[PDB]
Amino acid sequence: NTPEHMTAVVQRYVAALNAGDLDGIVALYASDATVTESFRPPFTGTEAIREFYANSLKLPLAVELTQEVRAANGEAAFAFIVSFEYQGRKTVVAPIDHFRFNGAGKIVYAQALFGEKNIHA
Ligand SMILES: C[C@H](CCC(=O)O)[C@H]1CC[C@H]2[C@@H]3CC[C@@H]4C[C@H](O)CC[C@]4(C)[C@H]3C[C@H](O)[C@]12C
Ligand SMILES: C[C@H](CCC(=O)O)[C@H]1CC[C@H]2[C@@H]3CC[C@@H]4C[C@H](O)CC[C@]4(C)[C@H]3C[C@H](O)[C@]12C
């Protein structure tokens, strides 16, 4: 996994969330990938990951990187914002994500870390 590829994957992830391209998001993940979101138990496998992002995309998510991606030794991490409006109220969440890649270049472990203080009205 080159740093260029892992960085491009982060970009394609951010772009697929923006397009609502659920297939495009899921295609980045290994069939047995595990995703850990703050405040929930982890979920594993294509079906669960697709269901998480489908429910997430019920919101009009606008996403963008806020710093350069960090990529080395089969892993990447990135800082970003997700903005949405729901029932007329605007929220911006600022996580840090971490992706771990398998030899085939697919995400096999992903984490989103965010707290109360990173959820802004
Ligand atoms: C309960 C709070 C509002 C609390 C508050 O305003 O103080 C709101 C804020 C964001 C809302 C969620 C946004 C995404 C989803 C939209 C769906 O159409 C209904 C379920 C979800 C999961 C909503 C559930 C719930 O309606 C939430 C969590
Ligand atoms: C879909 C992104 C990105 C996930 C990732 O990169 O791993 C995540 C990051 C922050 C997430 C939000 C955090 C606060 C809320 C938690 C609720 O229980 C469900 C709706 C909300 C509004 C979440 C919706 C969605 O799950 C978000 C917007």
Side-chain angles (χ1 to χ4, degrees), residues 40 55-56 58-59 84-87 89 91:
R40 310 185 174 193
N55 280 292
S56 295
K58 290 173 175 299
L59 294 171
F84 64 87
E85 194 186 290
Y86 185 68
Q87 298 179 347
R89 299 185 121 236
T91 295

PDB file of all heavy atoms in Angstrom, residues 40 55-56 58-59 84-87 89 91, ligand 1:
ATOM      1  N   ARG A  40     -20.612   3.703  19.939  1.00  0.00           N
ATOM      2  CA  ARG A  40     -21.299   2.484  19.498  1.00  0.00           C
ATOM      3  C   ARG A  40     -20.364   1.298  19.511  1.00  0.00           C
ATOM      4  O   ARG A  40     -19.153   1.444  19.267  1.00  0.00           O
ATOM      5  CB  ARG A  40     -21.801   2.638  18.047  1.00  0.00           C
ATOM      6  CG  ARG A  40     -22.588   3.889  17.785  1.00  0.00           C
ATOM      7  CD  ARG A  40     -23.096   3.788  16.343  1.00  0.00           C
ATOM      8  NE  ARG A  40     -23.975   4.890  16.042  1.00  0.00           N
ATOM      9  CZ  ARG A  40     -24.752   4.929  14.967  1.00  0.00           C
ATOM     10  NH1 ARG A  40     -24.754   3.883  14.150  1.00  0.00           N
ATOM     11  NH2 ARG A  40     -25.484   5.987  14.746  1.00  0.00           N
ATOM     12  N   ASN A  55     -27.897   4.542   6.518  1.00  0.00           N
ATOM     13  CA  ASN A  55     -28.574   5.308   7.535  1.00  0.00           C
ATOM     14  C   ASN A  55     -27.917   6.672   7.720  1.00  0.00           C
ATOM     15  O   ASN A  55     -28.615   7.668   7.972  1.00  0.00           O
ATOM     16  CB  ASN A  55     -28.623   4.514   8.853  1.00  0.00           C
ATOM     17  CG  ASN A  55     -29.708   3.494   8.847  1.00  0.00           C
ATOM     18  OD1 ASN A  55     -30.900   3.823   8.847  1.00  0.00           O
ATOM     19  ND2 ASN A  55     -29.316   2.217   8.840  1.00  0.00           N
ATOM     20  N   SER A  56     -26.585   6.724   7.637  1.00  0.00           N
ATOM     21  CA  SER A  56     -25.869   7.981   7.755  1.00  0.00           C
ATOM     22  C   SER A  56     -26.279   8.938   6.630  1.00  0.00           C
ATOM     23  O   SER A  56     -26.442  10.139   6.868  1.00  0.00           O
ATOM     24  CB  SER A  56     -24.372   7.710   7.729  1.00  0.00           C
ATOM     25  OG  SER A  56     -24.002   6.945   8.917  1.00  0.00           O
ATOM     26  N   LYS A  58     -29.033   9.219   5.146  1.00  0.00           N
ATOM     27  CA  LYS A  58     -30.341   9.830   5.305  1.00  0.00           C
ATOM     28  C   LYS A  58     -30.226  11.315   5.604  1.00  0.00           C
ATOM     29  O   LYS A  58     -31.167  12.058   5.322  1.00  0.00           O
ATOM     30  CB  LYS A  58     -31.162   9.167   6.430  1.00  0.00           C
ATOM     31  CG  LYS A  58     -31.611   7.779   6.090  1.00  0.00           C
ATOM     32  CD  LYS A  58     -32.275   7.097   7.320  1.00  0.00           C
ATOM     33  CE  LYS A  58     -32.856   5.715   6.971  1.00  0.00           C
ATOM     34  NZ  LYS A  58     -33.936   5.802   5.919  1.00  0.00           N
ATOM     35  N   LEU A  59     -29.078  11.754   6.178  1.00  0.00           N
ATOM     36  CA  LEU A  59     -28.708  13.149   6.390  1.00  0.00           C
ATOM     37  C   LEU A  59     -27.995  13.688   5.144  1.00  0.00           C
ATOM     38  O   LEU A  59     -27.292  12.946   4.472  1.00  0.00           O
ATOM     39  CB  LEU A  59     -27.787  13.259   7.572  1.00  0.00           C
ATOM     40  CG  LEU A  59     -28.398  12.913   8.940  1.00  0.00           C
ATOM     41  CD1 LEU A  59     -27.293  12.843  10.024  1.00  0.00           C
ATOM     42  CD2 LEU A  59     -29.525  13.902   9.297  1.00  0.00           C
ATOM     43  N   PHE A  84     -24.165  18.776   8.381  1.00  0.00           N
ATOM     44  CA  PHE A  84     -25.514  18.417   7.907  1.00  0.00           C
ATOM     45  C   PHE A  84     -26.555  19.334   8.551  1.00  0.00           C
ATOM     46  O   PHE A  84     -26.289  20.061   9.515  1.00  0.00           O
ATOM     47  CB  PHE A  84     -25.800  16.940   8.189  1.00  0.00           C
ATOM     48  CG  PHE A  84     -25.822  16.608   9.642  1.00  0.00           C
ATOM     49  CD1 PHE A  84     -26.983  16.736  10.369  1.00  0.00           C
ATOM     50  CD2 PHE A  84     -24.661  16.205  10.294  1.00  0.00           C
ATOM     51  CE1 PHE A  84     -27.007  16.445  11.734  1.00  0.00           C
ATOM     52  CE2 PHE A  84     -24.683  15.912  11.644  1.00  0.00           C
ATOM     53  CZ  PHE A  84     -25.871  16.029  12.357  1.00  0.00           C
ATOM     54  N   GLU A  85     -27.738  19.350   7.953  1.00  0.00           N
ATOM     55  CA  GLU A  85     -28.891  20.013   8.529  1.00  0.00           C
ATOM     56  C   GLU A  85     -29.952  18.940   8.782  1.00  0.00           C
ATOM     57  O   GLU A  85     -30.107  18.018   7.971  1.00  0.00           O
ATOM     58  CB  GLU A  85     -29.411  21.052   7.537  1.00  0.00           C
ATOM     59  CG  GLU A  85     -30.389  22.049   8.053  1.00  0.00           C
ATOM     60  CD  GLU A  85     -30.926  22.909   6.905  1.00  0.00           C
ATOM     61  OE1 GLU A  85     -30.140  23.725   6.377  1.00  0.00           O
ATOM     62  OE2 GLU A  85     -32.102  22.729   6.497  1.00  0.00           O
ATOM     63  N   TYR A  86     -30.622  19.006   9.933  1.00  0.00           N
ATOM     64  CA  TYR A  86     -31.695  18.083  10.249  1.00  0.00           C
ATOM     65  C   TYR A  86     -32.785  18.838  10.982  1.00  0.00           C
ATOM     66  O   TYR A  86     -32.523  19.501  11.986  1.00  0.00           O
ATOM     67  CB  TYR A  86     -31.236  16.893  11.093  1.00  0.00           C
ATOM     68  CG  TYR A  86     -32.306  15.882  11.315  1.00  0.00           C
ATOM     69  CD1 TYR A  86     -32.785  15.104  10.252  1.00  0.00           C
ATOM     70  CD2 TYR A  86     -32.880  15.682  12.582  1.00  0.00           C
ATOM     71  CE1 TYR A  86     -33.799  14.171  10.442  1.00  0.00           C
ATOM     72  CE2 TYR A  86     -33.883  14.749  12.766  1.00  0.00           C
ATOM     73  CZ  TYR A  86     -34.334  13.995  11.696  1.00  0.00           C
ATOM     74  OH  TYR A  86     -35.346  13.050  11.859  1.00  0.00           O
ATOM     75  N   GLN A  87     -34.011  18.728  10.466  1.00  0.00           N
ATOM     76  CA  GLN A  87     -35.155  19.473  10.988  1.00  0.00           C
ATOM     77  C   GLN A  87     -34.784  20.938  11.174  1.00  0.00           C
ATOM     78  O   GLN A  87     -35.124  21.570  12.172  1.00  0.00           O
ATOM     79  CB  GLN A  87     -35.662  18.855  12.285  1.00  0.00           C
ATOM     80  CG  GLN A  87     -36.173  17.414  12.095  1.00  0.00           C
ATOM     81  CD  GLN A  87     -36.662  16.774  13.386  1.00  0.00           C
ATOM     82  OE1 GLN A  87     -36.421  17.275  14.486  1.00  0.00           O
ATOM     83  NE2 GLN A  87     -37.366  15.654  13.251  1.00  0.00           N
ATOM     84  N   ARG A  89     -31.955  22.409  11.765  1.00  0.00           N
ATOM     85  CA  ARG A  89     -30.831  22.746  12.635  1.00  0.00           C
ATOM     86  C   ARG A  89     -29.528  22.221  12.042  1.00  0.00           C
ATOM     87  O   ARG A  89     -29.437  21.043  11.661  1.00  0.00           O
ATOM     88  CB  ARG A  89     -31.002  22.143  14.035  1.00  0.00           C
ATOM     89  CG  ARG A  89     -32.234  22.610  14.792  1.00  0.00           C
ATOM     90  CD  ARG A  89     -32.237  22.046  16.240  1.00  0.00           C
ATOM     91  NE  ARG A  89     -32.259  23.139  17.213  1.00  0.00           N
ATOM     92  CZ  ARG A  89     -31.362  23.329  18.184  1.00  0.00           C
ATOM     93  NH1 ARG A  89     -30.343  22.495  18.362  1.00  0.00           N
ATOM     94  NH2 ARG A  89     -31.496  24.371  18.999  1.00  0.00           N
ATOM     95  N   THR A  91     -25.483  21.161  12.152  1.00  0.00           N
ATOM     96  CA  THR A  91     -24.459  20.539  13.002  1.00  0.00           C
ATOM     97  C   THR A  91     -23.204  20.349  12.160  1.00  0.00           C
ATOM     98  O   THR A  91     -23.253  20.104  10.945  1.00  0.00           O
ATOM     99  CB  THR A  91     -24.957  19.191  13.560  1.00  0.00           C
ATOM    100  OG1 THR A  91     -26.060  19.375  14.440  1.00  0.00           O
ATOM    101  CG2 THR A  91     -23.833  18.476  14.306  1.00  0.00           C
TER     102      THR A  91
HETATM  103  C1  LIG B   1     -32.833  13.411  19.266  1.00  0.00           C
HETATM  104  C2  LIG B   1     -31.925  14.337  18.474  1.00  0.00           C
HETATM  105  C3  LIG B   1     -32.309  15.791  18.819  1.00  0.00           C
HETATM  106  C4  LIG B   1     -31.927  16.172  20.233  1.00  0.00           C
HETATM  107  C5  LIG B   1     -32.010  17.642  20.492  1.00  0.00           C
HETATM  108  O1  LIG B   1     -32.402  18.369  19.649  1.00  0.00           O
HETATM  109  O2  LIG B   1     -31.701  18.142  21.468  1.00  0.00           O
HETATM  110  C6  LIG B   1     -31.803  14.132  16.991  1.00  0.00           C
HETATM  111  C7  LIG B   1     -30.595  14.866  16.436  1.00  0.00           C
HETATM  112  C8  LIG B   1     -30.178  14.156  15.185  1.00  0.00           C
HETATM  113  C9  LIG B   1     -31.198  13.097  14.950  1.00  0.00           C
HETATM  114  C10 LIG B   1     -30.821  11.889  14.129  1.00  0.00           C
HETATM  115  C11 LIG B   1     -30.285  12.196  12.744  1.00  0.00           C
HETATM  116  C12 LIG B   1     -30.155  10.998  11.841  1.00  0.00           C
HETATM  117  C13 LIG B   1     -31.415  10.127  11.764  1.00  0.00           C
HETATM  118  C14 LIG B   1     -32.511  10.838  10.961  1.00  0.00           C
HETATM  119  C15 LIG B   1     -33.805  10.017  10.942  1.00  0.00           C
HETATM  120  O3  LIG B   1     -34.810  10.690  10.203  1.00  0.00           O
HETATM  121  C16 LIG B   1     -34.226   9.646  12.383  1.00  0.00           C
HETATM  122  C17 LIG B   1     -33.153   8.922  13.138  1.00  0.00           C
HETATM  123  C18 LIG B   1     -31.883   9.723  13.174  1.00  0.00           C
HETATM  124  C19 LIG B   1     -30.874   8.791  13.844  1.00  0.00           C
HETATM  125  C20 LIG B   1     -32.078  10.959  14.054  1.00  0.00           C
HETATM  126  C21 LIG B   1     -32.464  10.651  15.489  1.00  0.00           C
HETATM  127  C22 LIG B   1     -32.737  11.907  16.364  1.00  0.00           C
HETATM  128  O4  LIG B   1     -33.881  12.635  15.840  1.00  0.00           O
HETATM  129  C23 LIG B   1     -31.545  12.776  16.404  1.00  0.00           C
HETATM  130  C24 LIG B   1     -30.410  12.058  17.111  1.00  0.00           C
END
